[PDB]
Design a protein around this ligand. Structure first.
Ligand SMILES: CCCCCCCCCC[N+](C)(C)[O-]
Ligand SMILES: CCCCCCCCCC[N+](C)(C)[O-]
Ligand SMILES: CCCCCCCCCC[N+](C)(C)[O-]
Length: 220
């Protein structure tokens, strides 16, 4: 890998933008979640602040490689999940919000980490390991909550899955080339995503049967 090649830098501008914009949506989503869940406000605002600081780290990685982020590309990439989150929040559908932020986005991030980290540039490897270590000293707020409210949240979780899991496959196709340029394979990302998401769904309470069903709706 030539971290100074135009071709790397081109792909980085989109890929690093995605992580930057994702941290921004994470910050905003946690505040909206604090508002949907007033009894948990203090905790969620504390998480919001971590995600803002992490965004700064990722901004420094782009600066380190003299690349400016393609924020429009990043916004487009998140658009379908952003719009579904906003709609759900406006309807008070906190379960759907939590699926989007805490399952989909979360699992997408762990998988991205899992695939990116062995092929990262030094400066970014350091920053990213830092961020992930900090993240992993926490439990996943929405997984914990959904597990706690599983039986009553089950129908909305399935709708939310039907509506959002397909968007993930779209997101992955959009970055197949950039991922390859950065020595990350789409198939690898798909596999690791499905692993993190299945494991999260099982943890919150879904059966193997439910997981297979939720997966099948993932394919249309
Ligand atoms: C699957 C699309 C997202 C993959 C991006 C994962 C790599 C994290 C990169 C963060 N950064 C570019 C600052 O190093
Ligand atoms: C590369 C796609 C992921 C974008 C980065 C967003 C990370 C926010 C994760 C926050 N979390 C789910 C732990 O609360
Ligand atoms: C690609 C950079 C993404 C940052 C790492 C993703 C956050 C890990 C989530 C773990 N959690 C906080 C829920 O335990």
């Amino acid at each position: 890998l030539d971290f100074k090649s135009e071709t790397y830098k081109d792909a980085y501008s989109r890929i690093n933008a995605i992580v930057i914009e994702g941290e921004q949506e994470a910050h905003e989503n946690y505040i909206t979640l604090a508002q949907l869940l007033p009894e948990s406000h203090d905790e969620l605002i504390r998480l919001s602040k971590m995600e803002s600081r992490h965004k700064k780290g990722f901004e420094a990685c782009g600066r380190n490689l003299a690349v400016t982020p393609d924020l429009q590309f990043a916004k487009e990439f998140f658009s379908g999940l952003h719009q579904n989150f906003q709609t759900a929040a406006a309807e008070g559908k906190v379960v759907t919000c939590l699926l989007i932020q805490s399952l989909i986005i979360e699992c997408f991030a762990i998988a991205a980490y899992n695939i990116y980290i062995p092929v990262a540039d030094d400066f970014a490897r350091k920053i990213t390991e830092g961020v992930v270590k900090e993240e992993y000293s926490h439990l996943n707020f929405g997984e914990v909550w959904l597990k706690e409210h599983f039986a009553e949240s089950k129908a909305e979780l399935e709708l939310a899955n039907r509506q959002n899991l397909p968007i993930v496959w779209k997101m992955l196709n959009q970055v197949e080339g950039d991922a390859h340029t950065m020595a990350m394979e789409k198939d690898a990302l798909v596999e690791d995503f499905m692993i993190q998401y299945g494991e999260a769904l099982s943890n919150i309470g879904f059966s193997t049967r439910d997981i297979m069903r939720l997966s099948a709706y993932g394919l249309i």
